[PDB]
Amino acid sequence: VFTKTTADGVARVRKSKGKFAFLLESTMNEYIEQRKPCDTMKVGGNLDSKGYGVATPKGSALGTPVNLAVLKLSEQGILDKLKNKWWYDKGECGA
Amino acid sequence: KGYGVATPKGSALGTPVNLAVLKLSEQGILDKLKNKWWYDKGECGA
Amino acid sequence: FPNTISIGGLFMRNTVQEHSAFRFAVQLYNTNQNTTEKPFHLNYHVDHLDSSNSFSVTNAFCSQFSRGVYAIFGFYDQMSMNTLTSFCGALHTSFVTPSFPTDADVQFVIQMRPALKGAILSLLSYYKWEKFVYLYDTERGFSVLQAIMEAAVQNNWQVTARSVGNIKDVQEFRRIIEEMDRRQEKRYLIDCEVERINTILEQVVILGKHSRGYHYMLANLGFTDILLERVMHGGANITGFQIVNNENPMVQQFIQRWVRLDEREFPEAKNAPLKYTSALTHDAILVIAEAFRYLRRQRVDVSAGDCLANPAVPWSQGIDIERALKMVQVQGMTGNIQFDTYGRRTNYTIDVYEMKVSGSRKAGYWNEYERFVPF
Amino acid sequence: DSSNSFSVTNAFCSQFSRGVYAIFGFYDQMSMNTLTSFCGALHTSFVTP
Amino acid sequence: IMEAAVQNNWQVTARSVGNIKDVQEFRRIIEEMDRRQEKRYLIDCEVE
Amino acid sequence: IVVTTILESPYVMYKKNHEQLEGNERYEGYCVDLAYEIAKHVKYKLSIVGDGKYGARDPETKIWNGMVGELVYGRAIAVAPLTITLVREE
């Protein structure tokens, strides 16, 4: 049941006629849910909690400015509008 | 949003506390505590 | 064949135990009662060098050459290697030495110290050391450094080489270690002297760079002369190389008869661990005795002037003595002893020791053909 | 030849036996010690650039 | 240079290049110096 | 400033006619926009990681690959879907 690539798992889900379910990261599931032919969906809640971060070398002079910049972008709603832009505004399955 | 464990600036406990939080996250202890105090002690059931 | 052969000895500073082993080995050969084992008497003329004044080194070498010797056992360092090697090669006088093997292919000198190059390369290949920090000094030659560079080029390694020979401040060592840990370097190959290795280990202990996540490969014979207790208690992997086996019956007998010697007559013997250079000295005495016994057996006519003669005519019996010294196959305290045409050891086994918290354990052995058969 | 200490010693001793008041010459990192020691021990000056 | 650096509190990246025979080692040294944003070089080496 | 990223939609993409495009203008996606905003707040040059991996430690040789290895060994900031994990945070 393990697949070599995510695309293989998505194709297996689509061709199994409902007899295969793929376990994958929620972000990529939500992205694939907005792509043609619009025949897959995300069900249930997340099984754990993870976060994507911006990474810098240990001891870098950019670590604190980058952390503060990410925080500013979070409270200005820019992260949310970027995710909306690249997931749903450019989605090809509609709202 | 997120909840964090706060520490004074430049304190020696910041890195150990951050690593401890991450390692509790990997082991599933944080989710276990969340379930224990939200649903195990819940008054409504499933 | 002469009834009494006299050799020369060139001992530099901090060679008290080596001199004691030399005297004890000559005495052991002399006190043998078997006529076949002792067909001649062996004498020695011992001189102490300075290693910083080439004039004094040349004076001692020429005094030994003028008094009349058939071979010259001795030690050299980076400051006295060239003079002794060149004089021995030009005057056709054999130089049996436990010191580091010469980088260049030169004649009339027998370096019976097995090269760590092959063992180090085999251990790097076996341990998957595709990225490590090579801390080296040039006090024992450039063969190991050149071999590491060539192996890195061929195998596409990620060796970061640092020359710590000229470092005189421990803060430089601490800065180097901190910088290397910033890049997540967990493997260190330290090809340095015993004292420099001790200093580096003290610095890694001070910085706490000795937990179970670090591996240190000490590329230096003399694994028993390195202070390793604190690093052992830390839990870091330690790999070392040795040439003397304590379970060898010959070594056991030598130690049994060696720790029962008068301190005032054999200094640094009883209340002192046996250095591998002492074993090399004893095996060199064995090699010289075997070679001259072979020369007597074949009825080879062997039987002095001044160093600086123009033209410098060599005494013709040196070729036969060198050939006899380079064909010996003898079992000594370091195991099998054979030499090639350049006087370097062949068929030598280097014991690889892995050291853990319980103690040092013999992880295996390396040979030129079997290529580090594990245990 | 600086790489051969025997040749350096031969040259220096030939010049010394010939009879000189000073030696002008060059030394490398290998032949510096030999020439310096021989000049300082025989009380003969060595002028070097 | 070392005594002046410890006395005057300098940041000197000391590298011995006298045992280097491959020019790729020089290339790597220059690249890793530039990645640290090093602009000033003191080269005490032979003419070659 | 070298910004290491990984080609994974919708985070980093090639634009449709990136043959005529050059530099950073041949890239599109969430992480390109995020790097632009971060650069405004805090100059750079996107560098798609060569091996195409996120970053992991080899158990045998202890070498970091991917973007984490690009950061550790001084070759690159990493604006990409890189999960925050205990092993990486060290």
UniProtKB/Swiss-Prot annotation, chain A:
Disulfide bonds: C38-C93
Localization, UniProt: Cell membrane; Postsynaptic cell membrane; Postsynaptic density membrane
Domain of life: Eukaryota
Positions with a binding annotation for L-glutamate: E25
Oligomeric and partner information: Homotetramer or heterotetramer of pore-forming glutamate receptor subunits. Tetramers may be formed by the dimerization of dimers. Interacts with PICK1, GRIP1 and GRIP2. Found in a complex with GRIA1, GRIA2, GRIA4, CNIH2, CNIH3, CACNG2, CACNG3, CACNG4, CACNG5, CACNG7 and CACNG8. Interacts with CACNG5. Found in a complex with GRIA1, GRIA2, GRIA4, DLG4, CACNG8 and CNIH2.
Other comment: The postsynaptic actions of Glu are mediated by a variety of receptors that are named according to their selective agonists. This receptor binds AMPA (quisqualate) > glutamate > kainate.
Name of the protein in question: Glutamate receptor 3
Residues of the full protein shown: 707 to 799 of 888
UniProtKB/Swiss-Prot annotation, chain C:
Locations listed in the record: Cell membrane; Postsynaptic cell membrane; Postsynaptic density membrane
Cysteine disulfide links: C62-C307
Top-level taxon of the source organism: Eukaryota
Extracellular side: 1-375
Sugar attachment sites: N34, N237, N347
Its biological purpose: Ionotropic glutamate receptor that functions as a ligand-gated cation channel, gated by L-glutamate and glutamatergic agonists such as alpha-amino-3-hydroxy-5-methyl-4-isoxazolepropionic acid (AMPA), quisqualic acid, and kainic acid. L-glutamate acts as an excitatory neurotransmitter at many synapses in the central nervous system and plays an important role in fast excitatory synaptic transmission by inducing long-term potentiation.
Assembly mode: Homotetramer or heterotetramer of pore-forming glutamate receptor subunits. Tetramers may be formed by the dimerization of dimers. Interacts with PICK1, GRIP1 and GRIP2. Found in a complex with GRIA1, GRIA2, GRIA4, CNIH2, CNIH3, CACNG2, CACNG3, CACNG4, CACNG5, CACNG7 and CACNG8. Interacts with CACNG5. Found in a complex with GRIA1, GRIA2, GRIA4, DLG4, CACNG8 and CNIH2.
Family: Belongs to the glutamate-gated ion channel (TC 1.A.10.1) family. GRIA3 subfamily.
Misc. comment: The postsynaptic actions of Glu are mediated by a variety of receptors that are named according to their selective agonists. This receptor binds AMPA (quisqualate) > glutamate > kainate.
Protein name: Glutamate receptor 3
Species per Swiss-Prot/TrEMBL record: Rattus norvegicus (Rat)
Whole sequence portion shown: 24 to 402 of 888
UniProtKB/Swiss-Prot annotation, chain E:
Domain of life of the native organism: Eukaryota
Included stretch of the parent chain: 171 to 218 of 888
Name the UniProt record assigns to this protein: Glutamate receptor 3
Family: Belongs to the glutamate-gated ion channel (TC 1.A.10.1) family. GRIA3 subfamily.
Function according to Swiss-Prot or TrEMBL: Ionotropic glutamate receptor that functions as a ligand-gated cation channel, gated by L-glutamate and glutamatergic agonists such as alpha-amino-3-hydroxy-5-methyl-4-isoxazolepropionic acid (AMPA), quisqualic acid, and kainic acid. L-glutamate acts as an excitatory neurotransmitter at many synapses in the central nervous system and plays an important role in fast excitatory synaptic transmission by inducing long-term potentiation.
Subunit and partners: Homotetramer or heterotetramer of pore-forming glutamate receptor subunits. Tetramers may be formed by the dimerization of dimers. Interacts with PICK1, GRIP1 and GRIP2. Found in a complex with GRIA1, GRIA2, GRIA4, CNIH2, CNIH3, CACNG2, CACNG3, CACNG4, CACNG5, CACNG7 and CACNG8. Interacts with CACNG5. Found in a complex with GRIA1, GRIA2, GRIA4, DLG4, CACNG8 and CNIH2.
Subcellular locations according to the entry: Cell membrane; Postsynaptic cell membrane; Postsynaptic density membrane
Additional free-text comment from the UniProt record: The postsynaptic actions of Glu are mediated by a variety of receptors that are named according to their selective agonists. This receptor binds AMPA (quisqualate) > glutamate > kainate.
Organism of derivation: Rattus norvegicus (Rat)
